[PDB]
Amino acid sequence: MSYVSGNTLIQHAWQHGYAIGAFSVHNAETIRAILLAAEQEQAPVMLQIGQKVISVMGLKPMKEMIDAFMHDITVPVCIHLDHSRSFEQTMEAVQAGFQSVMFDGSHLSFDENVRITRAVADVAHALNLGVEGEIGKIGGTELITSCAEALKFSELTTVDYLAVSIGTAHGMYKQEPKLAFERLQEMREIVKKPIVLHGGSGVPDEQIRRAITLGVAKVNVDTELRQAFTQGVSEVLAASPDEYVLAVSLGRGRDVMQQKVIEKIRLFGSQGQAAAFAG
Amino acid sequence: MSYVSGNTLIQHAWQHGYAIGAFSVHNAETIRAILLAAEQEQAPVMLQIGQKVISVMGLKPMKEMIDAFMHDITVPVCIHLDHSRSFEQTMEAVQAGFQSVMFDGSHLSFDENVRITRAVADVAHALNLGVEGEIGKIGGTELITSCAEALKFSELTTVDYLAVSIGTAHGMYKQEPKLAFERLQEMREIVKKPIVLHGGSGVPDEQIRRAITLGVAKVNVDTELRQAFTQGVSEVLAASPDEYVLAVSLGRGRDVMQQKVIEKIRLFGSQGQAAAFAG
Amino acid sequence: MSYVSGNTLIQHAWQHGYAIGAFSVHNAETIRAILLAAEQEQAPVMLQIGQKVISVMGLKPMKEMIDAFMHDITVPVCIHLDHSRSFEQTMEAVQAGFQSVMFDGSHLSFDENVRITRAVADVAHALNLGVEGEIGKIGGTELITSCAEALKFSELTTVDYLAVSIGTAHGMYKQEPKLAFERLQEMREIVKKPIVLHGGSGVPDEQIRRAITLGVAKVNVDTELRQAFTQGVSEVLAASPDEYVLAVSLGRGRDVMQQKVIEKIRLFGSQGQAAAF
Amino acid sequence: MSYVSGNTLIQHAWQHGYAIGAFSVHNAETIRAILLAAEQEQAPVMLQIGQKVISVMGLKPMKEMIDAFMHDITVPVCIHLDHSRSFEQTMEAVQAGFQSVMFDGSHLSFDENVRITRAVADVAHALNLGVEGEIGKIGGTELITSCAEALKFSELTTVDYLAVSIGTAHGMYKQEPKLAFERLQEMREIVKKPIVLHGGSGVPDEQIRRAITLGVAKVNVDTELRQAFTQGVSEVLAASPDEYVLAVSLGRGRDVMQQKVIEKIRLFGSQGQAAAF
Ligand code: NA
Ligand code: NA
Ligand code: NA
Ligand code: NA
Ligand SMILES: [Zn+2]
Ligand SMILES: [Zn+2]
Ligand SMILES: [Zn+2]
Ligand SMILES: [Zn+2]
Ligand SMILES: [Zn+2]
Ligand SMILES: [Zn+2]
Ligand SMILES: [Zn+2]
Ligand SMILES: [Zn+2]
């Protein structure tokens, strides 16, 4: 399997002014949409196993399902644990052979977030896998992170890439977001680490491109892919409600989601970058 | 993994006047619907990997996906290759560690069907996995098999269980089927092997119960499960077209399909029979 | 595969006044000797992958070789990393799916031993595997740990089982050892955790038995098994130097080692205890 | 893992006038000797799992042990079932993911040998693994196959490579063998398939070289490797009977066996040929 450390992918992106897309997986067809998109675009990609899919399918089953679909894939792939709020769950992902983990301690006190994130980072560093932490809460579409908090957190935790609160939120945006570009620029010069953008779904393309120049090197996309999938399925079933061939109904969802992943890969500037990791 | 030879399951069913449900799988949620149904009902089950899913997801990936979802399952499970028209593909399933294979030579000449089916049977017998063959064409809802053809075929091939044409077809039935009960009765006394009913979707419950008494010991169900799945998905998306949580839309499909599998397990008389295979 | 947490095994031993034998593995025949002994005796066992075999065969290859030989085994088995002095190597064993790890920080300062041992313990507890640490150096056969130092170490690290310096050493004993029984008893009552005996090869049987009743619940055996193996091989090759059937020469080593493992299982009081799990 | 069909390897050897060495494995150290030799020589190799090791260690455990030791190997490797006289056992190797199988029907009637060998071949061809059969018995060192019988057998069975009786035998040679070179040449031109040489241990080097130029493209070596292994072990234990470090005693066996495998790789003309795959 062409699996690569998240640290390897993200550092390369950060050093070359592009971002790795971190695409959330939910089942077989969503895994395939992402992998086929990456293989077509010759792009390194992160597949994110997050809290919701863990609750539905299980952490280890989702890892094993990715493994099963890697047979024809030659591009760099990193399996990433998203939004973990448990040291135990994070260690389960490490034991299951993930290539990146996020311990999200953003709801803990600063000191407690530091303590657990550092413990996770030490494990990740030991095993050559990527580690993400978060300082500053990112909520739902339903507190911009300070430079000081981000620097202190980064230095005490030794995280490889850092999620910060910079004007995004998870879900479909009610109001169009406006990213804290000035804050990102300060962090580039002070924190000097790759930044992770949570809540990438529905952020205007122009703002993504700008954010990447300022050191965003991982962009998380989940909702926009599930919307694309749901649109494809809906199209089939609204037109032909007695279409019972899943290869048609869910396969159209797969196709529409694959197009969306291709769109994001290109937005992020990650197309063609697979070549950089062969040698 | 609690995996069991298809021959072991089917002989027990046949000897005890019940049938093993052979439920076709298509993706993660459909695997889970079947396994959760079997675990709840304490029923032995066959999961069928057929031609359409092979074309979409791949033979080995679907096997590996079942393996991934077996973590919490304690009932007897048999992975079965359905509708194979290739010696090569059948051998791939054997190598991938399936517990039953069907070589469907029903479109070949009698002698050619015998020749290849026997070759597959010898491999299956060697490795303690079940083998199914078919004599007589079974088409789509868009030639009842003779006793003589069934006996000769059965004796020359050494198949463990036999598919015959007895009034069923694949797909949604236009006209209600009427099974060839007299023919089944003759076969019970002459062929003296368990019979497989293809085209189990939409057959009246009373006719299934009667057929099982006459020696049907495997009932194949695919379309009716995909209909149930599609109904659940459709319900969510017709009510809430912007519901993008797959755990809700596809999970309702999973739930409605799980209820249908439970309904079939009970129809077949396989509920509670898991106990018979522990010891 | 009948794999069980080291903590589950050792706690049960400690609770019931017996010990789990921790038998060091080196290759295929040594793995088989141990597993066949355990299966015959219906005994829980630990198979220890230590530093020498890691250097020769590799950590992950040795794990996978154990897996390969578990096909016909029904007794509880725990794969244990022995004598790790590296956080990185200890994490490698965790990722490879070991059921117990020893971080041996005994050559570090107390503070640094506590720091790294605690980090390993946190990982082990999260994943339901056993964790061993060591306070006080245990050397070669060619200095007793205090109760207070053992308590402080134990409480700060949260280890499941603890190696202490109690009168043993690794290798062939020059002089006959004398264990610190009274110290063991104090630890049993104050530290209240299972004690691991390093240097179990060649200790008089009566002293082993006594140590186990006083709360030694894991006994490490390596040298005595390699001696048994080597004796069996030597016997064949000295008698028939042109015996080229490895099934005969190395198989006799396997047989003589298997008898030794059976002997240790019984010494430890672990025979029949598979039923409890 | 760099695993390659036996047919792919043997065809390439035959096409280019060299042979693949088929080295019998028995345990961890023997596997490592062979793999390290192949990796050093950048040579494609076959590792043969035969009847004796199946009886001792098991078919599937030996496969899994090879897998465990492939972590650092980049050369083409083919795991081959040797001397199977059971359709069932041959199917077990297929299911365990071997890259080549030998069904040895040479003790059966011609018709029955053809029948079972053909059935095995059909399975092998379907799954892209190599298949070997045998016409004419090859015994122990303590009768030449005809060209016509070899052609009929070959055409009916569709084997990829064929073992024939050509002047060799298994074990330590009592008398020096003399191969049937002219018969080999006839087979090369009429049968037009790669020939397998059983009993490769102890055959004079010049006769091996000549046989390979005449279309022998797989050479089986077992006894000579076990002798090399046994010599290394014996050396250590005779000199230092209380040497209990298996890394020393069995490691010397490994080293001496590795040198022997290197010697055979070069003899066969397979060094450097990894580049071709
Ligand atoms: Na969003
Ligand atoms: Na139907
Ligand atoms: Na000792
Ligand atoms: Na010979
Ligand atoms: Zn977040
Ligand atoms: Zn987020
Ligand atoms: Zn059919
Ligand atoms: Zn059918
Ligand atoms: Zn020690
Ligand atoms: Zn020690
Ligand atoms: Zn032979
Ligand atoms: Zn031979």
Q: Is B160 a catalytic residue?
A: no
Q: The tokens of A249 are what?
A: 């109904």
Kindly identify the ligand whose nearest atom is closest to the C-alpha of C208. 3
b/e sequence B164-186, b meaning 16+ C-beta within 10 Å: bbbbbbbeebeeebebbeebbeb
Taking the Cβ of residue C68 and every Cβ of chain D, the question of whether any pair is shorter than 8 Å is answered with yes
Output the domain CATH number for residue B264.
3.20.20.70
Q: Decide if D226 is inside a domain.
A: yes
Q: How far is the CA of C136 from the centre of ligand 9 (A)?
A: 9
Question: With an 8 Å Cβ cutoff, are B27 and A241 in contact?
Answer: no
Do the beta carbons of residue C100 and residue C121 sit within 8 Å?
no
D contact chains, 3+ CB pairs < 8 A: B, C
Does residue B1 lie in a domain region? no
Nearest to C65 among D68, D237, D246 (CB): D68
Read off the DSSP letter of residue D170.
Answer: B
The residue among B109, B63, B113 whose CA lies nearest residue B87 is: B113
Residue in B92, B94, B158 to test binding to D, most D beta-carbons within 10 Å: B94
Residues D116-144 as b or e (16 or more Cβ within 10 Å = b) = bbbbbbbbbbbbebbbbbbbbebeebeee
Amino acid at C138: I
DSSP state of A96: T
Q: Are the C-beta atoms of D71 and C57 separated by less than 8 Å?
A: no
Active-site position among D67, D72, D82, D255 = D82
D1 occurs within a structural domain: no
Sequence-distant (≥ 6) Cβ neighbours of residue B28 within 8 angstroms: A27, A28, A57, A61, A65, B65, B69
The verdict on residue A79 lying in a domain is: yes
Touch between D and A (at least 3 CB pairs under 8 Å): no
Bridge partners (DSSP) of residue D78 are D46
Q: Is the CB of residue A159 less than 8 Å from the CB of residue A135?
A: no
Look at strands B130-135 and B161-164 and give their pairing. Answer: parallel
Question: Which distant-in-sequence residues (6+ apart) come within 8 Å of A202 by Cβ?
Answer: A172, A173, A177, A223, A224
Resolution (A): 1.7
The DSSP output letter for D220 is: E
Asked whether the beta carbons of C162 and C199 are under 8 A apart, the reply is no
To which H or E segment does residue A219 belong? Answer: strand A216-221
Contact B235, B259 (CB under 8 A): no
* Closest ligand (CA of A198): 6
Please tell me whether C196 is known to bind a ligand.
no
What's the alpha-carbon Rg for chain D, to the nearest Å? 18
Is A126 within 8 Å of C87 when comparing Cβ atoms?
Answer: yes
Q: Give the per-residue SS3 of C76-140.
A: CEEEEEEEECCHHHHHHHHHCCCCEEEECCCCCCHHHHHHHHHHHHHHHHHCCCEEEEEECCCCE
Domain count, chain D: 1
Residue D91 to residue D82: CA distance in whole angstroms: 13
Q: Which ligand minimizes its atom distance to the CA of A105?
A: 5
Give the integer Cα–Cα distance in Å for B90 and C227: 51
Tell me if C41 is assigned to some domain. yes
The tokens describing D132, both together, are 């070997």
C52/D245 CB distance under 8 A: yes
Contacts of B117 in chain D (CB under 8 A): none
Among D103, D134, D104, D247, smallest CA distance to D196 is for D134
Are the C-beta atoms of residues C205 and D201 closer than 8 Å to each other? no
Q: How far, in Å, is the centroid of ligand 10 from the Cα of B16?
A: 59
Please answer whether residues C138 and C180 qualify as being in contact, where contact means their C-beta atoms are separated by less than 8 angstroms: no
Report how far apart, in Å, the C-alpha atoms of D217 and of each of A1, D11, D118, D212 are: 33, 8, 21, 6
The beta-carbon neighbor of D68 closest among C64, C234, C249 is C64
Give the separation between CA D131 and CA D154, rounded to whole angstroms. Answer: 11
Select from D65, D230, D244 the Cβ nearest to the Cβ of C249. D230
H/E segment holding residue A111: helix A110-127
Asked whether residue C1 is domain-assigned, the answer is no
Write the CA distances from D2 to A1, A75, D22, D76, integer angstroms. 13, 19, 16, 5
Q: Which residues pair with A84 in a beta bridge?
A: A103
Q: How many CB atoms lie within 10 A of CB B275?
A: 10
The length of chain B is 279
Contacts 24+ apart (CB under 8 A), B110-118: B110/B135, B110/B149, B110/B152, B110/B153, B113/B153, B114/B153, B114/B156, B114/B157, B116/B87, B117/B153, B117/B157, B117/B159, B118/B156, B118/B157, B118/B158
**Is the separation of the CB atoms in C27 and D27 below 8 Å?**
yes
Sign of CA dihedral A178, A211, A131, D68: positive
Q: What is the CB-side half-sphere exposure of residue A37 using CA atoms within 13 A?
A: 27
What letters, b where the CB count within 10 A reaches 16 and e where it falls short, cover A241-264? Answer: eeebbbbebbbbbbbbbbebbbeb
Closest Cα in chain B to D123: B91
Question: A65 and B65 in contact (C-beta within 8 Å)?
Answer: yes
Spatial distance between the Cα atoms of B171 and B220, rounded to a whole number of angstroms: 12
Radius of gyration in angstroms for the set of CA atoms belonging to chain B, rounded to a whole number: 18
Alpha carbon distance D268, D13 (integer Å): 10
Q: Is residue D105 a part of any domain in this protein?
A: yes
Q: What is the chain B residue with the closest CA to D96?
A: B95
Residues of A in contact with B30 (CB under 8 A): 246
CA of A165 to the centre of ligand 6 (A): 10
The CA radius of gyration of chain A, in Å to the nearest whole number, is: 18
Nearest residue in chain D measured CA to CA from B123: D91
User: Is C223 within the bounds of a domain?
Assistant: yes
Range of the domain at A259: 6-278
| Spatial distance between the Cα atoms of C55 and A95, rounded to a whole number of angstroms | 23
Closest to B48 (Cα-Cα) out of B261, B271, B278: B261
Q: Of A193, A188, A109, which is closest to residue A154 (Cα–Cα)?
A: A193
Residue A60 contacts C where some CB pair is shorter than 8 Å: no
Cβ atoms A156, A120 nearer than 8 A: no
Q: Looking at the DSSP assignment, which residues form a beta bridge with residue D196?
A: D163, D218
**Helical packing angle, B246-268 and B28-41, nearest 10°:** 40
Two tokens, residue B170: 């694949």
| B68 to A55: CB separation less than 8 angstroms, yes or no | no
Spacing, Cα D215 to ligand 12 middle (Å): 18
> Where are the alpha helices (H) located in C221-270, listed in sequence order?
223-239, 246-268
Nearest to A247 among B56, B67, B238 (CB): B56
Query: Coil, helix or strand for B43?
Result: coil
Which helix (H) or strand (E) is B133 found in, with range? strand B130-135
**Nearest residue in chain D measured CA to CA from C61:** D68
Distance (Å, whole) CA A66 – CA A97: 12
| Distances D32 to C51, D24, D136 between C-alpha atoms, Å | 19, 12, 33
Residues C64, C53: contact at Cβ < 8 Å?
no
